[PDB]
Each structure stands twice: as C-alpha cells, then as structure tokens.
Amino acid sequence: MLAEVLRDNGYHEYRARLQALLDIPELASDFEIHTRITDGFAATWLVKLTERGVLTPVERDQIIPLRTLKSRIERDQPLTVDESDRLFRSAHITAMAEAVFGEAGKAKRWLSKPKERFSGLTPMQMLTTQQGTTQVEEMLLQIAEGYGL
Template sequence: MTTIAFRPTGAGNPRRAELALLEQLLDTRIRNDSDLADLATGRVGVDVIDRLTAQGLKADELSFIIPRRTLTHRRQQHERLSTEESDRAIRLARIVAQATAAFGNPEKAMHWLRVSQKRFGRRSALDMASTEHGARLVEDALIQIDEGYFA
C-alpha cells in the first residue's frame, strides 16, 4: 500500500468515513490531497476498477475511465492504467467516497449518483463525473447535501 499525504480542500476536512473509503478504493494511504496527482502520474493498477465495481458501479458506468477492450488488454499484459485513466479513476473514487459519506449508506449514494437531476440538466451525477468540470459540480452538490442544503 502506497502512502500519500492528505490536505483538506474546499469546505474543510473530509470526514473520516470518506477518507477511509477513498483509501480503500485507491488502495493507498492518503495524507495530502495534492499528492493524488502524484498517484495518477504514478498510474494506478487495474484493480481499482474491481474495487469500484465491488462498491456497486456497473461496467458501463466505468467505461469513461477505460474502454472494456482496453481494460481486458491491460489485465492480460499486467499493465497499469494510463495517467489519464488513473486520473479519471481517482476522480470517480473521490465522488463515490464523498457520496457514501454524505448519504451515510452506499446504496443511497449509488441511487443518488445514478438518478437524473434537474441541477445537472437532467443528467446523472455519474454522467457529470465523466469530465473534470462536471465532477466539480457533483462535488459541490454533495457538499451542499452534506451541509444540509437541498438545492
């Protein structure tokens, strides 16, 4: 297990449950948020896809990270995800961990992530998470939910 430092972002310290799940999904100790970029640059293993699947995500919901055929090839060749794929996997892991902490329940979190929402132009949070800007909107919405706003 790699060790990474964690520094709070935005609205303050992340909750312990969120951090613990993020560490579990990424199979690394996190101490500094900015060091997640180093994790992406170092390229995460394809097993992160398995851990996201175990959390409840479906193959088609993970396809924006890496196409199935490419994933199969990487598994056969024992290769790690590319830097870009790693970055997308880390982004999704952060959102899943944040949603699970905000809702206090993985099933409720997955439901919220999957349902289309007016605030996202009738797209789901998972659809939005496929881009960096969309992911930021999802993170902002989760912060509002966690803090008691229902926008």
Template sequence: MASLLGRMTADDQKPIVPTDWLFAIRKGFSSRALDSFGQNINATDAELAKMLGLSVRTLARRRRMLILTPNESDRLYRLARVVVRAGDVFDHRANGLVWLRSPNAALGGLTPMSMLDTDIGTEIVKDLLGRIEYGVFS
C-alpha cells in the same frame, strides 16, 4: 478511498498522505484498483469504461497490461473521491450510489454519475453534494 480502490500499486502500498496519492497516480494504478472500484460500486465494464472515457476494448487491454495510465488513474481517483463524498453526504456508500445513479432535476434530469466523465461535470456534482449537505435548495 483506499478501501474503495483496493490495491492500487504493484507493490501493494496504500497511500497515506496526499503526496502518496500523487505518486501512485503518476506511476499508474494497478488494474486491480479498477476491478476493486467496479466491484465496490457494482458497475459493469461498459459503465466503468464510460466513466473513464475509454472503450470497453481499451479497458480490457488495460487489464491485460495490469496497469492504468497516469491519466486513467487520475480519472479513477476523481471518480472514487466523488463516490466517497456522496457516501458521506448520504451517510452510507449505498445511499450515495443510489443518488449518483438517479436522475436529478437540478442537473436537468441527468444522473450525477453520467457527469463524472469530465472535470467540469465532476465539479458540478461536487457542488450539488455540498448544497445538499448544507441544506441549500437544489
């Protein structure tokens, strides 16, 4: 996770245990985490904004402010967690990203990535990844 998000806090401390993540999210990730995530998944600003439920202008404003809100940090953490999970299921982050960006019949033709803007969509995608991992027909 830390490699996907890069430096998440202003003091450059990387979370080690779950409570570190909790405190980092509550404090608000550095906008560098957003940039690192975008680069690591090769996403445009428009795609990042959509995944985070923001406008492109708000995204630019967060970069100027150098910090995300706790809510935005939580969303970014949720997105990164799914990207890591998809990479684990498909044996490589690049393969996981291809799957996340491809229309999926089990999701009614939607791409898994398009569902990650809500908690319920994220849970549906994570459930589908679990079924794929264990060979359950999806």
C-alpha cells in the same frame, strides 16, 4: 480533496472511504495522491470495483474500454494517467457521496439518478468535465449543510 470540512470529521470519513476504494492512505499528502494517479493504478483494481458493486459495467468503460483493459491485465500494464485520473474522479465522488449520505447504497443511487438541476443528467455524467464535477460537489455540500436532505 482539500475542499472538505463537515466539522473536521466528515473529511476523515471521506478519506476512510477513499482508502477502501483505491487503497489511498488517509495520512497521504495531496502530492502523494497525485503521484499515485500519475504512477498509474493497477488495472485489476477496476475489475474488483465492479465485483464489490461500486461501479456499473458501463461507468467502468467510461474509464477504460474493456478490450484494452484486458490487454493491460494480460500484458501486466498499469492504467495510463488519463485512465487513472478518471478512476480517481469516480472514487472521489463516490467517497464524498458516501460521506454525506452515510450509506453506500443510498449514495450510489443518488449518483446514478437523473437530476433536475442538471437538466436530466445524472451526477456521474457531470464528472466528464472539471466544471461539472464542481457542480456535483457543491450539490453534495449543500446536502451536507442540510444533513442529508
């Protein structure tokens, strides 16, 4: 979130993409971002992501199982803090990857393919842990330092 540079602009691109995916304003402060996650994202937000092609069906139930998701939709419930956190983590890496690569298609393919530095794991499977997300972020930063390698 504030681990961003890329000659000042790149962060604006990240916030702009982040503002498309989860409706998070670019001028929102960090704590306001954290309260939006703890407040809980709308359950319908996740369905729209797949319709627009941002999330696989399977990465989506990595965030929340489907039957519970439909129960939240029907019972008009927001996603819980843990489900909202996992959704933000996916959107955050997606917005970051879109910023470095510059295109949604190329960024998503990079996030979904296995990588030799993760011993066959894809960047998305590294997002299951705090350390793993850091490794994906640094790899993206190293890619940015070489202008989309």
